[PDB]
Amino acid sequence: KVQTDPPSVPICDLYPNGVFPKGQECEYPEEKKALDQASEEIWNDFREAAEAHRQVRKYVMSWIKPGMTMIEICEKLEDCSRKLIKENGLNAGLAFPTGCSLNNCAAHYTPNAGDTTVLQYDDICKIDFGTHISGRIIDCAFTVTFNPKYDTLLKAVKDATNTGIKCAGIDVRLCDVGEAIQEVMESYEVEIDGKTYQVKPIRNLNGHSIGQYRIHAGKTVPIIKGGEATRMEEGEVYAIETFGSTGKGVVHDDMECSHYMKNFDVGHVPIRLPRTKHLLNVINENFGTLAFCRRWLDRLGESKYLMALKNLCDLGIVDPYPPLCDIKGSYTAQFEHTILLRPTCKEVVSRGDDY
Ligand SMILES: [Co+2]
Ligand SMILES: [Co+2]
Fold first, then answer.
1. Where are the domains of the chain?
2. Where is a divalent metal cation 1 bound in this sequence?
3. Is 251:202 a contact under the CB 8 Å cutoff?
4. Residue 12: helix, strand or coil by DSSP?
5. Which of 5, 15, 81, 207 is the most buried (most CB within 10 A)?
6. Which residues are catalytically annotated?
């Protein structure tokens, strides 16, 4: 068909032949064309997930408004994402929980059950959500504001993310990408409520390579100078993300934890404790090595699971990822895209007409 008003038609039904739209293709800063075409089914899975991400976020920008609760915003977004990705166990679905981190919090907040937080006119909210097909993950994120006082801070971070995307390429050193991002970000000065700031990158947050069912595959993309001279390689996939702040430019763990994920390297572990065994089975069936949140356990009918969840964290089977925040009173912004380092070109697979 054509897509519906509030979106409800799965991306795979909009593109009947199984061939999905490319993202932005870029020259990097024969045999390789054969090598590129050999992985076409993989690129196509990323593109299906990226078109779902494009259509979901456009819909979100149409209705997100102060006065909504954070739970209402997350549930309305995730409902649409499940429909457009055509959720099907671990073959298609949500790759990680909807981040909606506010103000000084830069990442890894999503509400748990009972959270009464309401979105305000002066809030700066980072919407970070992920889709996948067959474990091929799109990690892409943007910042929502309603007061025009944050416009230059948003522009700084968007320009820095685009600079990291342009610098990236096969054989490029990851430390060079960081230096480049920081140079652009720090070229911006902003004025918010009568105080001026030079925008600083959050130095202990980073982009990351992506692997199959593995949001963090092991290499990190720094956003300040001073990092490793490890090179980017042909065939790798990266989330190029940057964060800018008016605070210290450093985040710490804060608030209640909502995001959790099985450690990718831990094998099978026999458990006899009944509630802990049941919860690990629930995680293995529904999430595998993809991240989840407490709201997603509640939705599956689980209750009284918090001690079993703590047990799995203390065993090192699951890791907790608490919200990461700069100092009180500071403002943080984020923009992110997923890029594929194909043999013939760099594709910014999650690029849209919006950002
Ligand atoms: Co992200
Ligand atoms: Co990311």
1. 41-248+328-351, 249-327
2. 128, 139, 336
3. yes
4. helix
5. 207
6. 128, 139, 208, 216, 241, 336
- Asked if 347 and 44 count as a contact pair (C-beta separation under 8 A), the reply is no
User: From the CA of 107, which ligand is nearest?
Assistant: 1
207 Cα: distance to centroid of ligand 2 (angstroms): 6
Residue ranges with strand state E in 158-274: 189-192, 195-198, 200-201, 207-209, 220-221, 237-245, 252-253, 259-262
Q: Which are the contacts of 262, defined by CB distance < 8 A and separation ≥ 6?
A: 283, 284, 287, 288, 289, 317, 318, 319
Which ranges constitute the DSSP H helices of 106-233? Answer: 151-167, 174-185
Give residue 141 CA to ligand 2 midpoint distance, Å. Answer: 8
Q: Which CATH class is domain 249-327?
A: mainly alpha
Ligand 2 centroid, distance to 198 Cα (angstroms): 24
- Would you give the distance in Å from CA 168 to the centre of its chain? 18
354 annotated to a ligand binding site = no
Rounded CA separation 163/13 (Å): 35
Distance between CA 127 and CA 107 in Å, rounded?
9
The candidate with the shortest Cα–Cα distance to 331, out of 240, 204, 196, is 196
Give resolution, Å, one decimal.
Answer: 1.8
Does 253 count as an annotated binding residue? no
C-alpha distances (whole Å) from 341 to each of 36, 210, 348 are 10, 11, 9
Ligand nearest to the CA of 95: 1
Look up the CATH architecture of domain 41-248+328-351: Alpha-Beta Complex (3.90)
Name the residue type at position 115.
D
Instruction: Please indicate the experimental technique that yielded this structure.
Output: X-ray
Is 108 marked within a binding site?
Answer: yes
Q: Does 336 show up as a binding residue in the annotation?
A: yes
Separation of CA 95 and ligand 2 centre (Å): 11
Phi, psi of 235 (to 5 degrees): 90, -15
